[PDB]
Structure formats: structure tokens, C-alpha cells
RNA sequence: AAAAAAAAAAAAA
């Protein structure tokens, strides 16, 4: 320090301790300087020397100095490092090695060495999971990491998968546990083995959760039995398998394969409702009126079925539309499909008239070759076969929601509040100012939410809807009943997918207690926290591997003038993001690609509009056409240009 | 200043 002190020392301590401080997030740039962003309307310049103390995304406290030109930020204290556990490719030779983190915005190679104990000889090119050990703002000399796990070598074709799963600390392998023995839970299994139950799925599906059987009754009434796989017949609450299943809370589905929640021999074999195999199920028998309402006499019962057809969606859809080679190869199972189509028809009607029918965009399926190469990425629209299963499943889950509510009062419920009550006034004002009246109090009720939803659906474009997306809440998992706004239902609880959700297994045991007239333990409202956490991580992992594959699929289209139809999905000041409609990739279009004169060009995020010379040329919702300009593999980003 | 590690909802995987 500067050390000549009398009580000058005390003066300088006081003076320096009274300078202003701001907390904020570091934002690095292409150049040597950066900024400390405090709020969306305030930020301070960080001099190049000062940027050497921080990393992009670090949350810090800086002391603020007035300078000749502007106010300046000098980082003082690290509130939160942007980077702790991370993944990245390692560089460097033998005992002098660095890792550059996978995060697109962090380009700097961070020195590192292996942890004590690790057997892998780390070397240039292989991917690793490292831990940040050392920060300049912590008093340390410089940035330093230790390599904590070896993911794989750079040339591993399945790199996108292993890296992503490691990044999210998700399991890379099917459970090591072993199916043990089918339990006698005191249930009486109705033998439904003679009935023409069918399953309808993707051709590649190996773990069929649901099976359906339909029967005509007098009075234009239809009967539907929903038969669901039951792994709980093999896995007792509190078993080894149970504990393991609780932790992975879902099967993780990624392009080209999945990491199953339960041991693969029960999931893809012993529980799967395979064609012409005798299987235990937990069944729901319901009666549907002419208008599609689920009548009062719902029966949940344990049973045993034998599926008479592993049907595939597209074939069933082809047939109900009559195209294609495929035909139900038996009159009996043809009568099943068309009865099931009637049920769909009735229920689509019921849901339109008393709830909400969300208009549904296409799924996208990665078609992979042997070596993990993506051959194609295809739109997979929801047609009638999909709709047939969906209506049955929703109905079944509605039944479970009633029964659990009316018999236990608790369960694993899927709740969705629609709009956050703290946002209701802002929502109302925003729509009203675009010329669509809404009432902030109504809109927080089911009917209000539904009323608005229909009016929004009646709009030419999805523009206004997009403006209010920022106000919409996510489905949450709750331990007790609650509205599901997005589905326009009082209460909703899923039990139809136990092979691939610990939640549905929890509901299976609950429903079984009910069937048996037995006493049941309320689930602890902490297991929902594990579940929601995994659901989030799974969703991210799926999207992330997707993005990586979208890049490598589109790599050889860069610079070519092949055209893609694209929906503009989001606008930042940096430009636009578009979704390529017939593969579903996300591409970024940089602002200059839109005009080239920066002065006349505004890309408003709040307005979700691009304006050249004061006239809007693009808004968040338009379909435009694009070429692939560039795809940079280092950061797996697709840059598109308009046409 | 060519942006960025978040999904509004459902179904099937
Ligand atoms: Mg299924």
C-alpha cells in the first residue's frame, strides 16, 4: 500500500470507503473493455485493465469513479462467479494445459490441471468437466480450473450427447438396477386378456405405456378402457429400484436414444404393453356421453391385458384418411380404431365446449445414421392418430384427478395458474393499448383465461399473443388439486406414463390404495421439487443436443442459396431469431443483414418489431424466407440471411 | 454492439 500514515491513513481509508458502489453483472466485448450492467437502463464502463479481474457474467460489486469523459467501474468484490462447474475442450501439452469453457461467450482458455485421484491422462482435444478453483477477485493470482471428470475424446461421434449430459449432470446410462419379482399387492386383477386392446405409437417406441379398448353401449354412449403399464407391481415404495427411480424423475429422451428411468428390461420389455404378450395393467373404465362428458361411474381397477396390435400413428392416420399401404389386419382391430376415432371426435368436442384446445405445432424427429450422423430432421405433424391417444390420455388423467380428489384429497397434480396475479394489471393494460379489451381480475379466473384465449386464437396472426408470452406462467407440480389454466380444467393429474415418470408411479400407488380401500400417505411437497428440477434439466438437455445436431446438419448448407421458410420467433437489439419451419432449427439473423445503415434501423424487443425508416418491415410472428449464411461449429450457431 | 446456456399449454416418446 501507500504507507506514510500519521492519521492520513485513516483519512484515505474513510475516503475510499465512502465512494459509491454498484452491484451488477459483467458484460465483456470483442475489445479489451467491458461494462457493469446494473439494471436494463444503467451501466458503467469497465477499463481494459479492470476487465482482467473479471469474467463475462460474473456478478460483482464495483467502486465508481467519476472520470473526465464518463463514470467508470472498478471491480472490488465478487458476489457470484458466473462459472463454477463447467464443461469444455482441453488445449495444451502435457503438464501445461488449459480448458476453454463451452459457453459461447467465453472464448478464453483457462489454465488447469487434473484432480488428484483421476485416472485419465488428460490431453489436447478431449472434453472434460472442470471446476473453477481460482478467481482474481478472490485475491488469487489469476483464473484457474481443475479438470474433474473426463467426458470423452473430441472425435467421439456422440460428443453432443455426452457433453450435454455432463453439462447438466444427467445420467448417461440406463439404470444399473435389476427387475426382481412381481409383487402381490392384494389386488384382484380382472382378466381382460381376451379383449381387443391396442396400442398406438411411434414406430420406434419400445416402452408402450398405454393401451386402449373401446366398446359401443346403448344410448349412443361409448365406453373406453385405458390400460396403463404398471412398473409399481414390480417396484415397492421404498425399494432400491424405487429410490433410484425417484432420483432420475423422468426418462430422458434425446435424438436417437433415451436414458430410461427404470431398468431397461422392465421398461422396454416386462412392463411395456407389447403386442401379443400378457401384461399387468392398472386400468380405468369410463363411460362417455353423446356430447363426450365423462359420466360419473368411473372405475379404477387392476387388470391383465394382452394387446392385439402395436399400431403406429402415421399408419393409423393414413388409414382413417385412407391412403398408404397399411390396413388393420383384422376386422376386430379395425372396429377398435374407428370406435377410438369416435371417442376422439366426442372428446375434442367436449374440450372445445367446456375447456381449451391448444392449437398444436409439429414435432421434429432426428433421423440418425449408424455413426450418429443426422440424415434428416423431419416435421412430424399431429394428425388424428395422435389426437386419438391424446384425447384418451387427457380423459384418463381427468378421471384420476377426480378420483384422487374425491377419495384422498391429495395426489401428484399438474397445476397451471395461467397468468401470475402480480402481472394481471400489466397484461390488461398492454392488450387494451393494442385495442383488445381485457379485465385483469377476470383474466385470473379460469373462464376469464379461456375467454381471452379464444379471442386470441381468433386473431389473424399470433402477434398479440407473442406480446403477452412474457406474462405466462409454467405448469408446476403440486401435491394437492389446483386449476390447470392452459388445459382449461379444474384439476388434472397424470398417471398414464409410469414407465417414464416417477410422478405417475406415485399416482399409481395412490390409485391402488383407493382401489383397495386403503389408507394413503400424502406425498411430501419436496419430491415435487426433485421432479420439477429434473423436468427442467431434461427439457434443456433435449433442446441442447438438438441445437448441436441442427448445426452439424445445416453445416453444408452455409453459403448456398437453398431457401428455408422461417417464422420470426424473437427480436433483440442484436437482430432476430427465426425457426426454420420444416426442420425446426433456430437461426440468428444479425441486424446489419436487415439494413446495413444502423441509423435507420430499430430492433425493439418490447415492441417485438423491426423498423426501417419508421415503417415496420418485420414483427415477431411473420413468415419470411431465408438462406443459411454461416454456421459456426465452435459455438453451434446458425446465421441466416433473408431473401 | 453479430445476439445467446428458460419451456406459455398438451400428447406420445
Ligand atoms: Mg404410448
Amino acid at each position: 500500500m501507500l504507507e506514510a500514515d500519521p492519521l492520513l491513513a485513516q483519512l484515505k481509508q474513510q475516503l475510499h470507503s465512502q465512494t459509491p458502489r454498484a452491484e451488477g453483472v459483467v458484460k465483456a466485448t470483442e475489445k479489451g473493455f467491458g461494462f457493469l450492467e446494473v439494471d436494463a437502463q444503467k451501466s458503467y464502463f469497465i477499463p481494459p485493465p479492470q476487465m482482467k479481474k473479471v469474467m463475462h457474467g460474473d456478478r460483482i460489486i464495483a467502486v465508481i469513479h467519476s472520470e473526465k469523459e464518463r463514470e467508470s467501474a472498478e471491480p472490488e468484490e465478487l458476489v457470484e462467479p458466473f462459472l463454477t462447474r463447467f464443461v469444455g475442450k482441453v488445449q495444451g501439452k502435457n503438464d501445461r494445459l488449459a480448458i476453454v469453457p463451452d459457453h459461447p461467450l467465453l472464448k478464453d482458455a483457462i489454465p488447469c490441471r487434473a484432480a488428484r485421484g483421476l485416472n485419465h491422462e488428460f490431453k489436447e482435444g478431449d472434453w472434460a468437466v472442470a471446476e473453477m478453483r481460482r478467481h482474481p477477485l478472490k485475491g488469487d493470482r489469476s483464473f484457474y480450473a481443475e479438470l474433474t471428470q473426463y467426458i470423452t475424446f473430441g472425435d467421439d461421434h456422440f460428443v453432443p450427447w455426452w457433453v450435454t449430459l455432463a453439462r447438466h449432470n444427467l445420467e448417461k446410462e440406463a439404470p444399473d438396477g435389476v427387475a426382481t419379482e412381481m409383487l402381490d399387492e392384494g389386488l384382484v386383477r380382472e382378466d381382460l386378456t381376451a379383449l381387443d386392446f391396442v396400442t398406438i405409437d411411434s414406430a420406434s417406441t419400445e416402452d408402450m405405456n398405454d393401451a386402449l379398448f373401446a366398446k359401443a353401449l346403448p344410448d349412443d354412449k361409448l365406453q373406453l378402457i385405458v390400460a396403463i403399464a404398471d412398473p409399481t407391481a414390480w417396484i415397492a415404495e421404498g425399494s432400491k429400484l424405487d429410490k433410484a427411480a425417484k432420483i432420475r424423475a423422468f426418462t430422458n429422451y434425446l435424438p436417437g436414444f433415451n436414458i430410461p428411468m427404470l431398468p431397461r428390461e422392465l421398461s422396454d420389455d416386462l412392463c411395456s404393453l407389447r403386442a401379443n404378450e400378457v401384461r399387468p395393467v392398472l386400468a380405468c373404465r369410463m363411460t362417455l356421453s353423446a356430447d363426450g362428458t365423462i359420466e360419473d361411474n368411473i372405475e379404477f381397477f387392476a387388470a391383465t391385458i394382452e394387446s392385439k396390435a402395436k399400431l403406429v400413428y402415421d399408419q393409423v392416420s393414413d388409414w382413417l384418411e385412407n391412403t398408404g399401404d397399411w390396413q388393420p389386419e383384422s376386422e376386430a382391430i379395425a372396429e377398435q380404431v374407428r370406435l377410438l376415432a369416435q371417442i376422439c371426435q366426442r372428446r375434442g368436442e367436449w374440450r372445445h365446449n367446456h375447456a381449451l384446445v391448444f392449437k398444436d405445432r409439429p414435432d421434429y424427429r432426428f433421423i440418425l445414421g449408424e455413426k450418429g450422423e443426422v440424415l434428416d430432421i423431419v416435421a412430424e405433424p399431429r394428425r388424428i392418430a395422435n389426437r386419438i391417444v391424446e384425447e384418451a390420455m387427457i380423459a384418463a388423467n381427468i378421471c384420476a384427478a377426480r378420483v384422487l380428489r374425491d377419495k384422498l384429497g391429495f395426489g401428484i397434480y399438474n397445476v397451471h395458474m395461467g397468468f401470475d396475479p402480480a402481472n394481471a394489471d400489466a397484461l390488461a393494460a398492454l392488450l387494451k393499448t393494442h385495442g383488445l379489451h381485457v379485465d385483469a381480475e377476470e383474466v385470473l379466473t379460469l373462464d376469464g383465461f379461456c375467454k381471452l384465449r379464444r379471442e386470441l386464437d381468433a386473431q389473424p396472426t399470433g402477434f398479440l399473443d407473442s406480446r403477452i408470452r412474457r406474462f405466462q406462467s409454467f405448469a408446476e407440480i403440486s401435491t394437492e388439486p389446483g386449476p390447470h389454466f392452459g388445459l382449461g380444467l379444474e384439476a388434472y393429474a397424470t398417471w398414464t406414463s409410469p414407465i417414464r415418470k416417477y410422478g405417475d408411479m406415485i399416482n399409481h400407488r395412490l390409485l391402488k390404495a383407493v382401489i383397495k380401500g386403503e389408507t394413503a400417505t400424502r406425498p411430501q411437497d419436496e419430491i415435487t421439487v426433485q421432479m420439477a428440477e429434473r423436468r427442467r434439466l431434461n427439457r434443456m438437455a433435449e433442446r441442447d443436443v438438438g441445437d448441436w445436431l441442427y448445426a452439424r446438419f445445416l453445416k453444408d448448407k452455409a453459403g448456398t442459396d437453398t431457401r428455408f421458410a422461417a417464422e420470426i420467433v424473437d427480436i433483440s437489439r442484436g437482430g432476430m431469431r427465426v425457426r426454420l419451419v420444416d426442420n425446426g432449427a433456430i437461426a440468428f439473423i444479425p441486424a446489419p443483414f436487415l439494413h446495413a445503415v444502423r441509423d435507420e434501423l430499430v430492433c425493439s424487443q418490447e415492441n417485438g418489431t423491426v423498423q426501417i425508416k419508421g415503417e415496420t418491415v418485420y414483427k415477431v410472428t411473420d413468415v419470411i424466407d431465408v438462406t443459411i449464411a454461416e454456421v459456426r461449429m465452435e459455438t453451434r450457431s446458425i446465421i441466416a440471411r433473408p431473401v
Side-chain angles (χ1 to χ4, degrees):
Chain A
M1 283 67 163
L2 296 168
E3 213 86 305
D5 51 45
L7 76 169
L8 301 191
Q10 190 273 312
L11 175 60
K12 279 144 157 192
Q13 279 165 10
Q14 260 305 333
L15 288 182
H16 161 73
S17 96
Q18 290 185 355
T19 328
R21 281 137 171 87
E23 190 177 297
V25 184
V26 174
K27 187 253 197 172
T29 52
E30 291 294 60
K31 316 257 274 189
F33 63 92
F35 298 99
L36 171 86
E37 275 183 348
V38 172
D39 65 62
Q41 295 285 293
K42 195 174 219 145
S43 67
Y44 300 98
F45 174 85
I46 304 170
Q50 286 305 322
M51 280 301 291
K52 281 168 166 172
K53 301 179 169 186
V54 290
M55 189 172 41
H56 175 96
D58 281 341
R59 167 177 275 278
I60 62 162
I61 287 158
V63 317
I64 287 81
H65 313 277
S66 286
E67 214 83 36
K68 295 191 189 205
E69 312 181 334
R70 72 216 131 182
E71 279 174 45
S72 175
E74 182 178 300
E76 159 175 272
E77 171 175 346
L78 184 68
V79 177
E80 244 197 308
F82 172 59
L83 209 63
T84 55
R85 187 178 178 271
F86 64 106
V87 316
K89 206 162 189 188
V90 337
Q91 290 177 344
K93 268 310 295 273
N94 203 263
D95 279 70
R96 226 280 304 214
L97 57 178
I99 187 171
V100 9
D102 197 51
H103 189 289
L105 265 163
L106 315 172
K107 300 198 161 202
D108 285 323
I110 300 173
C112 58
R113 97 186 102 272
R116 279 136 248 78
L118 263 66
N119 279 357
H120 186 72
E121 253 291 311
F122 282 89
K123 73 193 206 275
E124 173 130 314
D126 60 47
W127 292 86
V129 18
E131 294 280 344
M132 283 307 295
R133 291 275 98 111
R134 208 155 272 157
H135 205 292
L137 231 317
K138 284 301 188 190
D140 305 329
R141 200 182 202 271
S142 57
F143 290 108
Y144 175 86
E146 75 174 25
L147 305 179
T148 283
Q149 161 200 332
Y150 161 63
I151 301 157
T152 208
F153 196 50
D155 75 353
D156 184 321
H157 290 101
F158 278 83
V159 151
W161 287 262
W162 315 136
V163 174
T164 298
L165 293 168
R167 180 162 128 244
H168 298 297
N169 198 24
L170 285 176
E171 287 88 4
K172 328 243 210 303
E173 303 179 20
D176 66 16
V178 74
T180 167
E181 187 214 338
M182 209 210 154
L183 310 154
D184 172 49
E185 298 165 283
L187 300 163
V188 271
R189 296 199 169 263
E190 264 196 64
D191 175 356
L192 274 48
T193 256
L195 305 179
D196 288 305
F197 273 86
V198 297
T199 58
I200 316 186
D201 289 295
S202 326
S204 65
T205 288
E206 220 54 40
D207 61 321
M208 285 102 270
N209 287 251
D210 52 289
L212 301 177
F213 171 85
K215 188 201 253 164
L217 302 185
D219 294 296
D220 203 19
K221 293 193 170 164
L222 292 164
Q223 157 168 129
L224 170 66
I225 292 169
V226 176
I228 301 308
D230 73 321
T232 53
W234 294 88
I235 306 167
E237 189 175 9
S239 60
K240 273 85 76 71
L241 300 142
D242 192 46
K243 286 179 165 59
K246 189 179 278 141
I247 287 153
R248 323 169 164 237
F250 294 93
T251 281
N252 191 20
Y253 299 96
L254 312 171
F257 69 93
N258 56 251
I259 287 86
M261 183 178 74
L262 303 172
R264 164 123 41 208
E265 78 174 317
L266 56 162
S267 68
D268 288 343
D269 196 348
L270 292 161
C271 295
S272 194
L273 309 173
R274 309 258 213 77
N276 315 115
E277 228 84 50
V278 164
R279 290 289 185 271
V281 298
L282 170 70
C284 177
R285 179 162 37 234
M286 67 195 81
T287 311
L288 280 7
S289 301
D291 74 355
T293 89
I294 303 163
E295 238 145 303
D296 283 331
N297 61 136
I298 302 173
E299 193 193 10
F300 275 94
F301 62 108
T304 290
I305 70 167
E306 187 191 312
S307 179
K308 307 284 145 49
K310 183 171 178 177
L311 304 179
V312 334
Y313 281 123
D314 288 342
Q315 287 174 330
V316 181
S317 315
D318 282 349
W319 182 76
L320 286 153
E321 289 162 22
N322 60 101
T323 332
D325 290 3
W326 187 85
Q327 199 176 46
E329 30 103 344
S330 152
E331 167 56 37
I333 85 101
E335 201 43 49
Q336 274 310 320
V337 169
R338 50 191 164 223
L339 274 165
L340 289 165
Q342 283 176 55
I343 285 174
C344 178
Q345 169 76 347
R346 304 246 183 123
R347 290 290 308 160
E349 268 168 57
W350 189 96
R351 287 172 66 218
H352 174 263
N353 308 335
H354 303 92
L356 282 176
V357 178
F358 196 114
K359 332 223 152 166
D360 261 293
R361 49 263 228 83
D363 286 6
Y364 294 108
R365 178 172 34 90
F366 293 76
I367 298 139
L368 306 189
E370 39 171 53
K371 274 162 194 197
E373 82 172 325
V374 352
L375 283 352
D376 205 5
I377 298 160
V378 295
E380 234 189 5
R382 300 212 201 162
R383 14 218 303 260
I384 188 134
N386 311 95
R387 230 141 50 212
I388 280 176
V389 173
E390 170 168 31
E391 299 293 354
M393 297 305 102
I394 287 165
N397 294 321
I398 276 166
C399 290
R402 290 187 196 165
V403 183
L404 298 166
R405 192 250 317 284
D406 291 40
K407 285 269 176 205
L408 300 191
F410 56 76
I412 308 307
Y413 277 92
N414 300 268
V415 299
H416 174 241
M417 80 194 165
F419 288 119
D420 182 65
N423 285 156
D425 286 357
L427 198 224
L430 173 60
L431 290 176
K432 281 159 66 168
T433 204
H434 285 266
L436 185 84
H437 185 90
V438 50
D439 185 86
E441 293 191 48
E442 274 185 56
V443 89
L444 298 169
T445 73
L446 247 209
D447 317 65
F449 179 83
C450 284
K451 183 196 186 158
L452 172 68
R453 203 53 253 168
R454 298 178 209 109
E455 185 65 6
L456 252 14
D457 294 354
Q459 302 297 112
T461 80
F463 182 72
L464 287 197
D465 190 46
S466 76
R467 257 61 289 289
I468 63 112
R469 189 136 288 101
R470 125 199 174 219
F471 299 113
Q472 284 150 356
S473 33
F474 326 139
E476 287 156 0
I477 307 145
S478 174
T479 216
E480 56 203 0
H484 196 291
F485 270 49
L487 271 166
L489 270 8
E490 299 297 317
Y492 190 58
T494 75
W495 69 285
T496 64
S497 312
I499 291 176
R500 57 163 170 106
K501 301 192 172 151
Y502 189 75
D504 291 39
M505 283 172 59
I506 295 166
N507 281 342
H508 269 224
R509 303 207 173 95
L510 266 42
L511 285 157
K512 275 180 176 181
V514 163
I515 287 154
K516 268 185 280 163
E518 224 149 282
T519 173
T521 347
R522 150 130 28 179
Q524 229 75 102
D525 12 290
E526 301 139 13
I527 91 289
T528 71
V529 159
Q530 177 59 25
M531 292 175 167
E533 229 300 272
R534 281 305 186 111
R535 165 143 93 229
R536 190 192 82 87
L537 291 181
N538 276 191
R539 192 151 301 179
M540 285 188 193
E542 194 159 348
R543 164 149 197 185
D544 285 350
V545 179
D547 291 332
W548 203 317
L549 295 194
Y550 273 127
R552 52 171 65 162
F553 175 68
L554 289 173
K555 191 180 174 171
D556 63 323
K557 311 297 262 181
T560 347
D561 39 12
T562 326
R563 299 183 179 198
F564 294 86
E567 176 176 34
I568 143 184
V569 93
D570 182 33
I571 288 165
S572 54
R573 64 178 70 177
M576 309 182 323
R577 278 156 99 255
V578 295
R579 190 179 18 257
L580 310 187
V581 298
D582 42 72
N583 60 52
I586 296 296
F588 173 68
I589 307 176
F593 284 35
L594 271 33
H595 193 69
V597 183
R598 281 67 17 93
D599 215 3
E600 296 147 6
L601 187 273
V602 186
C603 302
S604 176
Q605 173 133 56
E606 279 257 55
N607 284 228
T609 192
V610 182
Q611 234 160 249
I612 79 140
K613 272 146 176 149
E615 301 295 303
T616 66
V617 275
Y618 308 113
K619 45 179 188 272
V620 168
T621 230
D622 294 325
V623 157
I624 56 160
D625 285 339
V626 303
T627 69
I628 310 307
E630 204 188 339
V631 347
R632 310 110 127 105
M633 279 306 156
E634 7 134 46
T635 87
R636 288 90 65 178
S637 32
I638 303 96
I639 281 79
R641 157 174 280 108
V643 184

